[PDB]
């Protein structure tokens, strides 16, 4: 749904500049949220295997 919304938003934004451009696709790659410093969702996964 974010892929759906961002495309229409950008197309509506680029209208007045009148650049004459057509957008083929709007692709969305990985969205890692750990900020590379809070890589401690590892323990939140390692909770199961220790309780059992």
């Amino acid at each position: 749904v974010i892929r759906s919304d961002t495309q229409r938003e950008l197309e509506e934004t680029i209208r007045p500049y009148d650049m004459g451009i057509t957008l083929l696709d709007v692709n969305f790659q990985a969205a890692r949220p750990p900020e590379e410093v809070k890589a401690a969702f590892d323990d939140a996964i390692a909770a199961r295997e220790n309780e059992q």
Partner: protein
């Protein structure tokens, strides 16, 4: 004899390969997945005019981007067991059909895709140690 030249384009079933890249499932678990795609040239005129010279690198980049997008969109749905149980079974076929099918088609560029496979699934270090 001297006004023109012509370009020879391969037609064999070409093979694209890559390296590992991470993912995520809804259980917050994360995997490692590697794959490869079989691609064939559908219509030669559109291909040559579009890709700009017909050397493999740009076609590789296009397919790489589009494949990463569609796969990562798909695996994000199903659960951790559902990867390992049947990762071929409906993942590969569904993503093939969706990727192969106007603009945004990946065929509009002039490329035909044969089939898609998954090669290996590992786990991160800490979870491996725990199990």
């Amino acid at each position: 004899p001297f006004i023109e030249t012509v370009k020879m384009l391969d037609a064999r079933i070409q093979t694209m390969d890559n390296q590992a890249d991470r993912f995520v499932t809804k259980e917050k678990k994360d995997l490692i997945v590697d794959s490869y795609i079989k691609w064939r040239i559908s219509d030669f005129s559109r291909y040559y005019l579009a890709t700009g010279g017909g050397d493999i690198s740009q076609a590789e980049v296009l397919l790489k981007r589009k494949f990463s997008d569609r796969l990562r969109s798909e695996i994000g749905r199903l659960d951790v067991k559902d990867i390992v149980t049947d990762s071929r079974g409906r993942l590969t076929l569904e993503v093939r059909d969706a990727l192969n099918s106007n603009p945004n088609s990946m065929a509009a560029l002039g490329i035909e895709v044969v089939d898609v496979r998954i090669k290996q699934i590992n786990l991160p270090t800490e979870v491996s140690e725990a199990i």
